[PDB]
Each structure stands twice: as structure tokens, then as C-alpha cells.
Nucleic acid binder design. Structure first.
Lengths: 339, 350
DNA sequence: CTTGACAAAAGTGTTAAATTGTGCTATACTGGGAGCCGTCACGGATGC
DNA sequence: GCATCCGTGAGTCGAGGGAAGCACAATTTAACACTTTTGTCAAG
């Protein structure tokens, strides 16, 4: 179904026949042989094993895929110039990389069967499948056919591991580490078991005691507070679809017209108050309090500006500050701004 | 947005555009001398997935023989459509027939038709009808105890294949080193091995069989067909608006009113791009702008709870899918997995 | 305006403890699951 | 012509409505001294 992404994907993975026991072993053996062959090629030519694998992979995947091609072609010729005995490993590597793609493609039904059990936990069905596919790619690399265990036995561990980790890393707007997600899930499981046995919602003391040593009611409450999802700003309220959460949340960052006006009134009055001070005394206070550069200047830092000693500035500033106190008592024009 | 601006410039229907955009059909960009059902492939032709595999990788079908029964054909024999490969199965295509998993190897010693049973975890290491000197390995296996070797000189015969693989390809026997390796694409006259002695007689993908020491060139073409916006963007970058305008103007004089009406609608879009200075390929996004955070706030309510906008969720989905596609591309994932992620990424932007 | 000693505050390692990020598990497992009608009525625009 | 897909449908208010674990390497954070930098005190 074109309009249904899931049906379209299921149709595509249904075009690859399932591997038989004989077919699966041959593909796995070729993958293992190719990896070993690449190791020998690196030893023979001294090239990085990662570099050789990328070149071999690039040639198998063909020109339908976007290290630039010029370097890929150059190294490819260098491999093709090896002696006949050394050239064989290149043939084995090419067959190994081709087999790896087929082995991955034949097991895309396995990931779907696993991934259908993880829906409703924060990720959509197609997101779970893609995270499962990444686990399936890892299983192919690490799988060992010598042990004679079937592929689904070993690949199921990696497929579930990738799907479960993806939920822990992508299911919440505010990401919570993996260890904290494990604690949260365990805490929820413990509460549900206590809830079914007490016939009521357990208190934080019941849950803390159930969890084990190192757990108290205060920690249980903190974990529950941490595990709170944010609420959407577009959630409707009321039957009419004309009111939302965002319509009731004030903006408290930008100053209000009253706040801005009182800040300018305070600055205006202080400018007049500092006018009564001497030419230098007013400047010292405007520096020691950061009224010029925006940031406070230390006694020594101020002293360099006026070439006076540190102790002297502390004297004039203290004296200049005392005078401002005397004037205010005579007018009381500045006490309102202090709250 | 009906009628689509991208479709009008490219002359693609609403259904045609959606099929390519959401990875349902291929659009040809370079036929590379490809023939589909005997009709040469032309540019801008929509290819279904089945057609693309036929052209790009060739024809091959695998027929599973019943257990115990022995194939009536030999290993490496060309067959025609409808020919009986096994006593109960007849092929549907003409090509080389190859034994998949010979269950039993019947080596004839000279002094003795000794028979050996092959299991799923064992593989035959020598071709059919090969003189194996006493000591050479015949069937390899994980356990050296179960390894099968030849007591003395003989001829190995393969029997009881698990299945018969019919492939439409050309087989070129060789003796010395092969000039090509598996996965290479060659055209007629290309050297294959023996210093130019063996040459490709047809286009196809070359796969070298070490066991049979022959080179199989699977008949296929290096067609350039792509899906998604990467194909459409390629088409939009090649449009010559000046050239297109002249063609539309000439079609504006056609006696038919319906034909003249259609050309006017197309040429109105072309005129808009020519006069405005915009480029048609700018309708495909290569970078997605991200809104400033204060217009999609994540604010803390008075009670300590957090409130956020829906744009952050939509942005996160696009970033999560974009990053995953990058990881898959670096891992050399199969085309099915890459196509699904590309289709998901397209939907995340939508 | 200038020193000289003075204790506190701010700043610079150094290191152990929390915290977080990543890899791994081998019996065999191989194509989803929800929905579903007072389906809203009309006019415009397009594809035939 | 018919068949199909898309966008449109008054205003203000109001309360009310807010399902795995473990082992380990890495990284970040908090404690602890110990070392300059800053404000002070008393003088001259």
C-alpha cells in the first residue's frame, strides 16, 4: 500500500526468500572467510583493514552509491596488481562482502517479528524496525557458524538489544540516561506489583522498601519527579478547539513596562544624586559599582585608571559613599527604589 | 499543492511524482544502452522495482529439488525455457544450470564408485569431474575428523543437488589469473583473464567462480535509475528554462484548445522561475532551517512541570531519522534498509 | 596621599566519587493491527 | 461530459481545564587543600 508505509515495507522484505539451513551456513561461512581474507590483504599490502573493507564494499555496492571514487579506483587497481596467489584473497573478500548483504537481506522478517512486541513505548513501528535492523547488521558481523547455532538464535539478542536501547535514547523529549531509564522502569514494575497486592496504590515507603538497600521514600519521590514528561503547549482545553495551554502561560523573561520604567527612574535619580559628588568621587563609585563598563572594578584595577594607590581609593569611595547617605536623609528621594 | 510545481516543470503526473518521491518506482536518468523486453530504455522512464532488478542484476531463479531425487541436468549445462531440470521441476528461464548443494559426491577411483554423504555444515571444495590426486581435500568441514579426502586418484561427480540455480549469464573458462573480480561490470570486448585472451561478449555483472575456475558474466546493464528527491533534484538541475520556454511557446500555436491550454499552464510556471531568478532545484531541501528556540519554547510552568511545543517533537524525529540514515550509509547496509530510511526521512520532513 | 601586616574571598590544581555511555548475551524464533459511517455538504479545480 | 481531490464554514466572553541487567571504560562533578588576589586595619 503506497499510502501505508508499513505495508510497503512488508511487501519489499517479502520479495527475498527465506534462507534454508544449507543456504544460511554457506552465507555465514563466506562472510567469515571474507573477513579473514581482508585481514591477510592488509598484511600483504600494509593497508588499513578498515580502508580495504570500504573499497571492497564500495565495489560490491556498485556505482549506485555516492573517500572519493578516484582513491577507491586507485586502491582497487593496486589490489588487482597483486600476484596470483595474493589476488585470490581479493576474490574471497568480494564474495564475502556480497554474501554479507544477502545474509542481512534474508533476515529482515526476523526483525519485524521481534519489533512488533515493542510498540507503544515511545517509538513508532517503522522506527523500531530500523533500530532493529541496525542490531541485525551487528549480529551478522559477530556471528560464528562454527558453534553450529542457528542465526536467529544469536541475531535475536542483538535485534532486541538495539530496539530496547533505541527506546531508552529516543523515546523522551528530555533524554534520560540509560541507567536512569532502567531505574525508572524497575521502579514502575515494583510499584505495580505492590499495587496489585495491597489493593491500592503503594506509598513511597512501600516502594522504597520493595526496591532494596539504598532506597528511601525521598529518593523514590525524586525519581518519579525526574520521570515526568513535558506537557505540550498545544493541548486543547475545553470542548471548543480554541483554547490551549500556551494561552495561559505568561512570559517571565522579558521585563514588563513597569519593571523597565522603574529601572530607568532609579538610574535617572542616581545620576542626579551622583551629581552632588565630586568629579572624581562620582567616577570612583561609578567604577567600583560597575556603572560605566557594566562590571565592577577592584581597588587595584580602579587605581590604575587614576594612578592612585589601592588604599587611597577605598578611602575616597568610603567617604564619597558616606556623603550620599547624608543627602538622602535630607530628601528621602531614593529610599523608595530599595523596596 | 495541486497542481504540483515540481510536476509541472518535469511533466510528471501527481501519481508519477509520488511514486518516485516515496520510493515506489525508479526514474531512468541514463539508460546505458539498456533493453527492457526488447524495447530500448529511454530517459525519464519510470521503472518498477521488478523491472529495475531485471535490468540491473539480471534474471535468475532457484528451483528446490525434492530430497533424494537426482537432477536430470548436469552442472553447468545451458537450458531453455520449459526444460525439465529435475524429475518433477521444469525451469522457467534459459541459462546456465548450477548445482547449489550437492548432497552426495561420487568419486571414481582407478585400481570403485565410492559415495560420500554431504551434510549442511559441509561444502564441496572441488568441481565436478576433476582429477583429484590421492590426498587432495574433497569435502571440507568444521571438524577435521569428518573431513572427506580421496584415498587415491579418481574423478569426482556431484549428485543429489539441493536446488538448481538457473542464471542468464555467459561462462568463460580460464586457466591463469583473472583480470576482473566479483561484482565488476563489463561490456563487450572487456578483458576477463589470460592477458586478454578471454573477453566479455555481452554487458553484465561478472562473478568469478574459484571452484569451477570459470568467470560468469550475468547479463545485466549498468542503468542509472534512482528514486526519491535525489532523482527529482537531478532532473530539476538539468532543466534549461530558456530551451523549455521555446518548446512551450511552439506548442502554444497548436490548433487544439486543450493542447494550448496545457502549454500555457506549464509556461506560466516557467515564466515565474525565469523572471524571479529562483532555481527549480531549490524546491528540494538539502538543508532544513531550524526555528529559533524562543518561538518553540520549552518553558517551566510555575508548578515545576515542563511545557514544550510540538515543533520540538517534529524536529527530533527528523534529526533522529537523519542521524540513523548516516550511520546506516557508513555501515554499507542493503538497499532495502537504506530505501526505508530515506522514505522515512522524506516523511519526517513532510 | 602613601606602606605593612592582616584574614577572607576568589582562583587553581589534584583526586576520589558519582554519573553517564557503550558493548554484550549462542536452543530456535523470520510480513502489523487497528478500524469500522448520521462517513458533511458544496463549489472549485484538475485529470479524463 | 463525469470522476476525483481539496478547502471552507460569525464575534466576544466564560469557567472548566493542565516493558532486562550487568560489566566496564569515560566523562563529569564534588571535596579538599593550598596559592594569588581583594578588602581592610593602622599608621605615617
Amino acid at each position: 500500500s503506497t499510502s501505508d508505509p508499513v505495508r510497503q515495507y512488508l511487501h519489499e522484505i517479502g520479495q527475498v526468500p527465506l534462507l534454508t539451513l544449507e543456504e544460511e551456513v554457506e552465507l555465514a561461512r563466506k562472510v567469515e572467510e571474507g573477513m579473514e581474507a581482508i585481514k591477510k590483504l592488509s598484511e600483504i599490502t600494509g593497508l588499513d583493514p578498515d580502508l580495504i573493507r570500504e573499497v571492497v564494499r564500495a565495489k560490491i555496492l556498485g556505482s549506485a552509491r555516492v573517500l572519493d571514487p578516484k582513491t577507491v579506483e586507485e586502491i582497487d587497481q593496486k589490489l588487482k596488481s597483486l600476484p596470483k596467489e595474493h589476488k585470490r584473497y581479493l576474490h574471497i573478500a568480494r564474495e564475502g562482502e556480497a554474501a554479507r548483504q544477502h545474509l542481512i537481506e534474508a533476515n529482515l522478517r526476523l526483525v519485524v517479528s521481534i519489533a512488533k512486541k515493542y510498540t507503544g513505548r515511545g517509538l513508532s513501528f517503522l522506527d523500531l524496525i530500523q533500530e532493529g535492523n541496525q542490531g541485525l547488521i551487528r549480529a551478522v558481523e559477530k556471528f560464528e557458524y562454527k558453534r553450529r547455532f542457528k542465526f536467529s538464535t544469536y541475531a535475536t539478542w542483538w535485534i532486541r538489544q538495539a530496539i530496547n536501547r533505541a527506546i531508552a535514547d529516543q523515546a523522551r523529549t528530555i533524554r534520560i540516561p540509560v541507567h536512569m531509564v532502567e531505574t525508572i522502569n524497575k521502579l514502575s514494575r515494583t510499584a505495580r506489583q505492590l499495587q496489585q497486592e495491597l489493593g491500592r496504590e503503594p506509598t513511597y515507603e512501600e516502594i522504597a522498601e520493595a526496591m532494596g538497600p539504598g532506597w528511601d521514600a525521598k529518593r523514590v519521590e525524586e525519581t518519579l519527579k525526574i520521570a515526568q514528561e513535558p506537557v505540550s503547549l498545544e493541548t486543547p482545553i475545553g470542548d471548543e478547539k480554541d483554547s490551549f495551554y500556551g494561552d495561559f502561560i505568561p512570559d517571565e523573561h522579558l521585563p514588563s513596562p513597569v519593571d523597565a520604567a522603574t529601572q530607568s527612574l532609579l538610574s535617572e535619580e542616581l545620576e542626579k544624586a551622583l551629581s552632588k559628588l565630586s568629579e572624581r568621587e562620582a567616577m570612583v563609585l561609578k567604577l567600583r559599582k560597575g556603572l560605566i563598563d557594566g562590571r565592577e572594578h577592584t581597588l587595584e584595577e580602579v587605581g590604575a585608571f587614576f594612578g592612585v594607590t589601592r588604599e587611597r581609593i577605598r578611602q575616597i569611595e568610603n567617604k564619597a559613599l558616606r556623603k550620599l547617605k547624608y543627602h538622602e536623609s535630607r530628601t528621602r528621594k531614593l529610599r523608595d527604589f530599595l523596596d | 499543492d495541486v497542481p504540483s510545481k515540481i510536476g509541472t516543470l518535469l511533466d510528471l503526473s501527481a501519481t508519477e511524482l509520488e511514486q518516485v518521491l516515496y520510493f515506489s518506482k525508479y526514474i531512468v536518468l541514463d539508460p546505458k544502452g539498456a533493453i527492457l523486453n526488447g524495447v530500448p530504455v529511454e530517459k525519464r522512464q519510470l521503472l518498477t522495482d521488478e523491472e529495475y532488478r531485471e535490468l540491473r542484476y539480471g534474471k535468475q531463479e532457484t528451483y528446490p529439488l525434492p530430497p533424494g531425487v537426482d537432477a536430470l541436468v548436469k552442472d553447468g549445462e545451458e537450458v531453455v525455457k520449459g526444460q525439465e531440470l529435475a524429475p518433477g521441476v521444469v525451469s522457467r528461464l534459459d541459462g546456465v544450470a548450477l548445482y547449489r548443494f550437492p548432497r552426495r559426491v561420487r568419486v571414481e577411483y582407478v585400481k570403485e564408485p565410492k559415495d560420500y554423504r554431504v551434510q549442511p555444515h559441509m561444502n564441496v571444495v572441488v568441481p565436478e569431474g576433476a582429477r583429484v590426486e590421492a590426498g587432495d581435500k574433497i569435502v571440507a568441514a568444521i571438524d577435521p575428523e569428518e573431513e572427506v579426502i580421496a584415498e587415491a586418484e579418481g574423478v569426482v561427480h556431484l549428485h543429489e543437488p539441493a536446488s538448481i540455480l538457473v542464471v542468464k549469464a555467459r561462462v568463460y573458462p580460464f586457466e591463469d589469473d583473472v583480470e576482473v573480480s566479483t561484482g565488476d561490470r563489463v561490456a563487450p570486448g572487456d578483458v576477463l583473464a589470460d592477458g586478454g585472451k578471454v573477453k566479455s561478449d555481452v554487458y553484465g555483472r561478472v562473478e568469478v567462480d574459484l571452484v569451477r575456475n570459470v568467470v560468469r558474466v550475468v547479463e545485466s546493464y549498468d542503468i542509472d535509475a534512482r528514486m526519491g528527491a535525489e532523482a527529482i533534484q537531478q532532473l530539476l538541475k538539468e532543466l534549461d528554462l530558456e530551451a523549455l520556454e521555446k518548446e512551450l511557446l511552439e506548442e502554444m500555436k497548436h490548433p487544439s484548445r486543450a493542447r494550448r491550454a496545457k502549454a500555457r499552464k506549464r509556461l506560466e510556471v516557467v515564466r515565474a522561475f525565469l523572471d524571479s531568478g529562483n532555481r527549480p532545484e531549490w524546491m528540494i531541501l538539502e538543508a532544513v532551517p531550524v526555528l529559533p528556540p524562543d518561538l518553540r519554547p520549552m518553558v517551566q510552568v510555575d508548578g515545576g512541570r515542563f511545557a514544550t511545543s510540538d515543533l520540538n517533537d517534529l524536529y527530533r524525529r527528523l534529526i533522529n531519522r537523519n542521524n540513523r540514515l548516516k550511520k546506516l550509509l557508513a555501515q554499507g547496509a542493503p538497499e532495502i534498509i537504506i530505501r526505508n530510511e530515506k522514505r522515512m526521512l522524506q516523511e519526517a520532513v513532510d
